[PDB]
Each structure stands twice: as structure tokens, then as C-alpha cells.
Design a protein around this ligand. Structure first.
Ligand SMILES: CC(C)(COP(=O)(O)OP(=O)(O)OC[C@H]1O[C@@H](n2cnc3c(N)ncnc32)[C@H](O)[C@@H]1OP(=O)(O)O)[C@@H](O)C(=O)NCCC(=O)NCCS
Lengths: 81, 154, 93, 360
């Protein structure tokens, strides 16, 4: 069994991110799921960016590649306008 | 740059009972006439633990599409109990209104749903058997979670 | 009492905020994920930066939705089910 | 006099106690980055803060802050920059007997900004009014969010609000192709069509040849030298995402002044549309107003108080770390801060009273 770096994202960082999100209190057994979601999202974005870079036939993924990768994730807001 | 974009979604029957059919007054905007039609799905998530308990309650089609502001009614049947866990049925869940052009999904709206007993006495002492005739749903129309995707049209 | 923690009150917000996640753990994470996707490519520092920006933004929004989900359950403490519900609310990632 | 300027805007029969704390214009860091092989333009900064309060009419001493706004003013040999740093309310305006149900805070902001613009308008000098609209709960008054009567706008609402605030000031000049003025709005994540929806209604009836509102960035106006690196083309305000991203990009520097990940301004904003502040599930506004014209202090009211940089910071920081959870807490904090300001200015009292005259 190998080690996972997603367990390297410390709990205080998660709590601070929750605080910034407007959360007042959190359950002690929630960090695992947070790490799961984080890893899933980051995974998807990385898949898209790496794929776009590969098709571009370049050896390094630039920030713009990440941008065009994020453009596929859609825009999330409140209301319509 | 989207050709079609929502402008409002007003829930008519709310807070309606759980078994009552879902009825949405949907107002959207179109920039120019399109070849294909608009597909509208309404998925009820019976259990958040897995994406398997998702139930596409109803799928409608709208075509052709007039240029300008358009309003229409969207009716959907109540979910099935035989596909929902008897535990996670009461409480808080989610529903998704999906708008897709030519099969390609480009609008995804999300709503919260709170199933509540009509009396506090039932909330204090819940029966082992779910009383569907005494459960009313309460969904929020305040802040819908709208996600807009960019797709190719014609 | 499983380890429930009450978060410090936000007395006043600010328009610009530094990213909360440490850079090196995020970097080695990104590298691990890149390896698991089976590719010989690596990200620019600016690219990893953008990745972190997006990740943290996503997490903050998801935490807003989570808090809202916990509110409609008549609770102040957010839970795992609330996070899953928030995920499904967003439209699953 | 600022009191007179504000009095002409407020509705008739509206009694409001104001306090205007500023600092003497002192040398500071350049707002724009210096081009390679050159020196930064000498910049003089000048802080301003307006605190608007009312009375719940228990007696006369009863006083509670209903609004607060902090604005920074920059000055160089070519540009005068008026930057709205912060703005917040407490929501206790509801306590005012017979509330006229008008967009009061909007009028106050408009009046204050107009006064600053007029009193800082230098002969034949380009003047810019910049601000960053981000809808969050509380900025200046801690615990004021726990006041139910506080009407906190959302993203779209706040952007539209600031646009409506600036719109008259914009239309106080001539269209640009006889001082001219043009407005620039940028909402990260929105195309031009979706951005247009934030413009005031008046924008719908302007000249197509000579528009007033534009979804773009004043490039060739803010910078007379478009050949300079992109880093020298963006202002670096305090507490601003633009600044943070500019630093993060400047970390890529050893080509003179050229970045690596961002080659032009368009790329810069394309990247800006995906920053942590601009894409947290809420919309964000960038607003600019460009004006192109072809005791040494203007404000003389007793509400005005000119403190040193140190004393200014002391007063403001004393105010913004108070409690406004309840009415009594808000009033108490108001009194305490008022007394502290009176102390820092070596006076027995600071602040003046204003009563609106307009009734149209
Ligand atoms: C945004 C803010 C400064 C303005 O407060 P405000 O209550 O909206 O006062 P306004 O004069 O701007 O009123 C604007 C509109 O809201 C309406 N309104 C005011 N109070 C209201 C209330 N309690 N309930 C419902 N509507 C209200 C008014 O009728 C007015 O109508 P209009 O659309 O025709 O203009 C204040 O809400 C606030 O402090 N928000 C939190 C701080 C913040 O977001 N700062 C961001 C700085 S970038």
C-alpha cells in the first residue's frame, strides 16, 4: 500500500476554508469527505488540462491550459438576473 | 455567449404535499430561432449517499423556440417510494432541473428540498412506517444553484 | 462529541484573500494525480497556482452550499451528508 | 463644505450627524509599477473616511452609525485616482422615525464621491474613480450582520447598485468619442451581453456612436505608453485581487518586465476571471470612471477632521473593531469612537449635523 498526498491537506486548512465559506461549526468526522471532493475536482481539472496540453503537442502544461480546462467546469452562481 | 439562457423559475405549488406533482413556471430567453428543440429533465435525488437513487421524474421537449422572452409550465410526476430508502426519504434532499439543447447539456439548476411532517407531534415521535399522506415538501425558491455550460448550438 | 470544532467568528471580511492551502502539499498532490493519470507532463508553477485558486474557490462555494444545506436541517454544525448534498446541488462537480 | 453638498441631496426633514476623517496628502508607493530601466512616478496618497449616523430619538445623545465608507485618493503628475476601498452599513437606519423609503445610502455615496471629485479636480488633469464591488456580509461593522434589518445585497444587486451610484457623476460630463467622461465595467465570468445588464437604464438610451458605458478596460487612457510591459498597466490598490495576482505574476520575473504565463492584458483578465475572489460562486465587479478635461482644505464643516497617518489609522481601526450586534452595542460603539476621534483631534467634539432640503 502506497501513501496518498490528499491526506497531506491538513485539517486546519480545511477548517479555515470552511470558515471562509460561512460555516460556523463542523463535525469531527468530515475531513475525509472534504479531501475526497477536493481530490475529485482537482483530478477532473487535471485530466482536462493534461489532455488539452497533449493534443497541443507540448511538453509543459501552462496556466492557460488550466484556464481552458476550467472553462469546461461551467459557471456556478445564485439566481438568474 | 449563449443563445438560450434562463431568466427565472417560479415554483407554483409550494409548500405542496410530497406526492403532489411538481409544477414549475419557467421563464427563459432566446436570441434567435434554432433548428433543434429544448430538452428539460427533472431529477430527484432520493439518496445523497449514491448517484444511483437519482430518478428522472419527467422529460419534456420544447420546439420550436420563439425569439425573445418565453414562459412555460413544466409538470412532472412525484417520485417513486420503491426506489427511495425508507430512512433518508424524510429530511433534506436535492432536485436538479436540466436544460439541454440537441442532447447537449448547457443549463443545470439545483434546488434543496425539505420533507416535513404536517404536525410537530409526528416530528417528535416519527413512526417506523413513513406516512406519505402526512408529509409535505418545502423547497426553497430563494437561491437556486444555477450552473451555465457553454455548448455548440447549430 | 466526535471532535466537533467551532470556527472563529469572521468579524470583518476583505476583498483579497491569500490561498489557505499550503503550496508544497498541493504541488505534490498535483504531481501524484498527474502520475496516476499516466502522463509524462508536468505543470508550470503558474499553472499549479491557477489550479490552487480554482480548487479553493470551488471548496469555498461548496462550503457555502454545505452551510445552507445544514441550515435547512435546523443545524449549525455541517456534516458529510451536507457536503454530498451540496455536491449534488452544484450538479455533481 | 461637505455638509452643504450632502444637505442638497438628502430628502427634506432628514436629520443626520456626519463625521469626515481625512489625512494630509503624504508621499507613498506608486500606484502603477515602474517600467524597466526607469523610476516610479512620485505618488501622493490621501485617506478619507465618512461616517453617517442618526438618532433613535431617545434624547439627543442617542446616536447610532448607519453608514460608513473609506476612500483612498491618489495623486501624480498626470492622474488623480479616487479609489473606494470599503463601504458598509449597520442597518439601524430603520430606527429613523418616518423613513422616507428612498435609496438613501446610494445618495450619500453619490454625494461624498461627487464632493471628493469636485474638490480634488485639478486643472487639466485626468481624473479616475476606481472601485472593486464584492458582495460580502460585513466590512466595517462587526456583528452588524446579526441585525435583521440590515439589507445585504447580493453580487448582481451590488454591482448594479454601484453602477447606479456612479452613473449621475458620469453623466455630469460630455460623451467621449468641454470635459469628457466615460465609464468602464468588467464583470469576471460574464460576456459583453451579460455585462450590459448591469448598466443603468439610461445607458440603453445613449448615442451608439458616442457611448457612456463600456465593458472594457481604459488602457490607452490610464497609460500614455502602451509599449510598456503589462505589469505597468494595472493599478495596485491595497486589499485588491488585482494587486495579489499582479504580485503572484511578478514572482515570475528575473525580456525586460515581461511575464511568462501572461503575455498581454487580455490574457491577464482572462486569468482574472478564474481567480479565487472572482469565482467563489458569486459575481464580482470592477468599476472605473475616466474623466478627461481639455488650514488648506476644501471641506470646512465641523464634521471634518484632519489627522496624521498614525492617528487616522488609530481612529479607523478603533471604529472597525467594535460591536454592532444590538442597538445598544451600536450606540455605545458610536459614542466611544466619537469620543476617541474627539481625543485624537484634540477637540471636545468632532462631527456636524446635516438636514436635507430637496423634496422632489
Ligand atoms: C449595500 C449597502 C451598502 C446598501 O444598503 P441598502 O439597504 O441597499 O440601501 P440602498 O439605499 O442602496 O437601497 C437600495 C434598494 O434596496 C431597497 N431596500 C433598502 N432596504 C431594504 C430592506 N431592509 N429590505 C428590502 N429592500 C430594501 C430600497 O428600496 C432600494 O430600492 P432601489 O432598488 O429602487 O434603489 C448595504 O446593504 C450593506 O451594507 N451591505 C453589506 C455590505 C457590503 O456588501 N459592502 C460591499 C462594498 S463593495
Amino acid at each position: 500500500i502506497l501513501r496518498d498526498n490528499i491526506q497531506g491537506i491538513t485539517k486546519p486548512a480545511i477548517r479555515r476554508l470552511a470558515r471562509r465559506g460561512g460555516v460556523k461549526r463542523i463535525s469531527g468526522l468530515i475531513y475525509e469527505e472534504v479531501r475526497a471532493v477536493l481530490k475529485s475536482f482537482l483530478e477532473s481539472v487535471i485530466r482536462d488540462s493534461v489532455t488539452y496540453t497533449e493534443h497541443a503537442k507540448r511538453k509543459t502544461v501552462t496556466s492557460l491550459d488550466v484556464v481552458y480546462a476550467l472553462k469546461r467546469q461551467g459557471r456556478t452562481l445564485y439566481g438568474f438576473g | 455567449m449563449s443563445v438560450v439562457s434562463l431568466l427565472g423559475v417560479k415554483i407554483v405549488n409550494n409548500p405542496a404535499p410530497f406526492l403532489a406533482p411538481y409544477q414549475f413556471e419557467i421563464t427563459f430567453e432566446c436570441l434567435e430561432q434554432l433548428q433543434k428543440d429544448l430538452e428539460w429533465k427533472l431529477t430527484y435525488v432520493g439518496s445523497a449517499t449514491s448517484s444511483e437513487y437519482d430518478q428522472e421524474l419527467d422529460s419534456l421537449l420544447v420546439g420550436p423556440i420563439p425569439v425573445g422572452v418565453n414562459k412555460f409550465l413544466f409538470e412532472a410526476d412525484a417520485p417513486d417510494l420503491k426506489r427511495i430508502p425508507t430512512s433518508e426519504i424524510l429530511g433534506v434532499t436535492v432536485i436538479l432541473l436540466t436544460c439541454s439543447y440537441d442532447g447537449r447539456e448547457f443549463v443545470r439548476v439545483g434546488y434543496y428540498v425539505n420533507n416535513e411532517y404536517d404536525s410537530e407531534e409526528l416530528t417528535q415521535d416519527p413512526p417506523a412506517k413513513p406516512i406519505i399522506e402526512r408529509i409535505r415538501r418545502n423547497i426553497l425558491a430563494e437561491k437556486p444553484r444555477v450552473t451555465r455550460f457553454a455548448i455548440k448550438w447549430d | 462529541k466526535p471532535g466537533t470544532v467551532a470556527l472563529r467568528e469572521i468579524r470583518r471580511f476583505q476583498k483579497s484573500t491569500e490561498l489557505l492551502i499550503r503550496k508544497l502539499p498541493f504541488q505534490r498532490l498535483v504531481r501524484e494525480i498527474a502520475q496516476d493519470f499516466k502522463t509524462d507532463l508536468r505543470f508550470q508553477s503558474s499553472a499549479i497556482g491557477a489550479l490552487q485558486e480554482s480548487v479553493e474557490a470551488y471548496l469555498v462555494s461548496l462550503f457555502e452550499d454545505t452551510n445552507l444545506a445544514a441550515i435547512h436541517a435546523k443545524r449549525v454544525t455541517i456534516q458529510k451528508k451536507d457536503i454530498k448534498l451540496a455536491r449534488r446541488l452544484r450538479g455533481e462537480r | 463644505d461637505l455638509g452643504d453638498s450632502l444637505a442638497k441631496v438628502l430628502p427634506t426633514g432628514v436629520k443626520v450627524t456626519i463625521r469626515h476623517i481625512s489625512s494630509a496628502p503624504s508621499p507613498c508607493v506608486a500606484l502603477f509599477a515602474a517600467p524597466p530601466g526607469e523610476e516610479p512616478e512620485s505618488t501622493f496618497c490621501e485617506n478619507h473616511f465618512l461616517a453617517v449616523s442618526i438618532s433613535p430619538n431617545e434624547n439627543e445623545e442617542s446616536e447610532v452609525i448607519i453608514f460608513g465608507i473609506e476612500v483612498l485618493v491618489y495623486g501624480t503628475a498626470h492622474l488623480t485616482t479616487i479609489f473606494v476601498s470599503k463601504a458598509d452599513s449597520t442597518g439601524y437606519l430603520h430606527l429613523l422615525k418616518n423613513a422616507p423609503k428612498v435609496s438613501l445610502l446610494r445618495l450619500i455615496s453619490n454625494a461624498f464621491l461627487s464632493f471628493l471629485v469636485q474638490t480634488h479636480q485639478r486643472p487639466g488633469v485626468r481624473l479616475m474613480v476606481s472601485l472593486f464591488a464584492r458582495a460580502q456580509n460585513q466590512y466595517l461593522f462587526p456583528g452588524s450582520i446579526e441585525n435583521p434589518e440590515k439589507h445585504v445585497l447580493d453580487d448582481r444587486g451590488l454591482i448594479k447598485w454601484w453602477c447606479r451610484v456612479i452613473d449621475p457623476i458620469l453623466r455630469e460630463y460630455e460623451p467621449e468619442t468641454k470635459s469628457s467622461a466615460t465609464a468602464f465595467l468588467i464583470v469576471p465570468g460574464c460576456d459583453k451581453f451579460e455585462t450590459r445588464g448591469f448598466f443603468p437604464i439610461t445607458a440603453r438610451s445613449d448615442g451608439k456612436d458616442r457611448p457612456r458605458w463600456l465593458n472594457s478596460y481604459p488602457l490607452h487612457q490610464l497609460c500614455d505608453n502602451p509599449n510598456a510591459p503589462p505589469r505597468c498597466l494595472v493599478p495596485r490598490f491595497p486589499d485588491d485581487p488585482k494587486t495579489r495576482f499582479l504580485i503572484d505574476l511578478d514572482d515570475e520575473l528575473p525580456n525586460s518586465g515581461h511575464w511568462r504565463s501572461v503575455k498581454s492584458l487580455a490574457q491577464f483578465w482572462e486569468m482574472m476571471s478564474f481567480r479565487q475572489e472572482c469565482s467563489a460562486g458569486r459575481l464580482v465587479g470592477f468599476l472605473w470612471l475616466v474623466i478627461n478635461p481639455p488650514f488648506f482644505w476644501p471641506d470646512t464643516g465641523r464634521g471634518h477632521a484632519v489627522l496624521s497617518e498614525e492617528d487616522y489609522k488609530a481612529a479607523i481601526n478603533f471604529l472597525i473593531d467594535q460591536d454592532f450586534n444590538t442597538k445598544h452595542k451600536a450606540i455605545a460603539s458610536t459614542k466611544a469612537w466619537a469620543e476617541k476621534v474627539a481625543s485624537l483631534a484634540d477637540q471636545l467634539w468632532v462631527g456636524q449635523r446635516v438636514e436635507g432640503r430637496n423634496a422632489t
